[PDB]
Amino acid sequence: MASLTEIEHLVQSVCKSYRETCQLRLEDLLRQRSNIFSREEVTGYQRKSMWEMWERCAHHLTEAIQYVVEFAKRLSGFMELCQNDQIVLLKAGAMEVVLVRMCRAYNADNRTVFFEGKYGGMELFRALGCSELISSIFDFSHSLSALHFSEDEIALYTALVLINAHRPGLQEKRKVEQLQYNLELAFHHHLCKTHRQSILAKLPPKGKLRSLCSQHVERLQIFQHLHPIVVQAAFPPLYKELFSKILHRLLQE
Ligand SMILES: O=C(C1CCS(=O)(=O)CC1)N1CC[C@](c2ccc(OCc3ccccc3)cc2)(S(=O)(=O)c2ccc(F)cc2)C1
16 A cells, blocks of 8 residues: 555645644744843743743643644544544644644754743743743753754654554554554655654654653643632633543534
């Protein structure tokens, strides 16, 4: 199954689907690198309440995940899977895709991330009270920045993060397996053609993405236990569904 001309076509459709749903253009994020938060603006974030910061971050994550849902819907073969499998793959992989996509918004020169219009370091998130999770995210982006990914590499690698046949809950495991194998062939074909197979050994282990997602869910249970009405009243419904039937509605459209 699948010849070279079908694998090359798969490369281009994955790359196109990603460009159409990448949220912020790479050029836009790069042209903003000199726009950094002043020490007074950083102090303003540190002085914000923990629940306000948690609500702003959960809001930004939700928006980014909505683009990931759109990337999945445009991905060859994903809409062909059953709804249960689509939801299982999105519930487990949407946050993982966002964690990879996030390296485009990270400047490794000053160790800053693009957040709410300007670049800021780890210290911008001190009010969250989850320094271990923040450092883990920042280190993860630092590690991905050393790979010097092209937009096409991120498109192909994020399609594979999402189409994972080993996710618990899958009803048509073989159909996801076949789709995964085709995307793996297309990612490796593209790396071989561009003389970039050296990155395979340097890609993060699968347990690193699982550890980041786990730390997120753990820090959320801590925050929710202290502010259950804040999560209930001010957190996005899609966020609560994923981490605490929006997905079904987003997939129907
Ligand atoms: O970077 C993006 C976007 C990706 C798509 S794009 O087009 O390149 C524009 C940028 N992000 C989308 C949202 C972001 C996000 C990342 C991780 C995350 O983890 C869960 C969490 C929740 C609450 C507290 C701590 C951690 C939540 C949101 S963010 O808010 O900017 C943020 C950033 C750093 C950080 F350390 C914490 C929050 C990253």
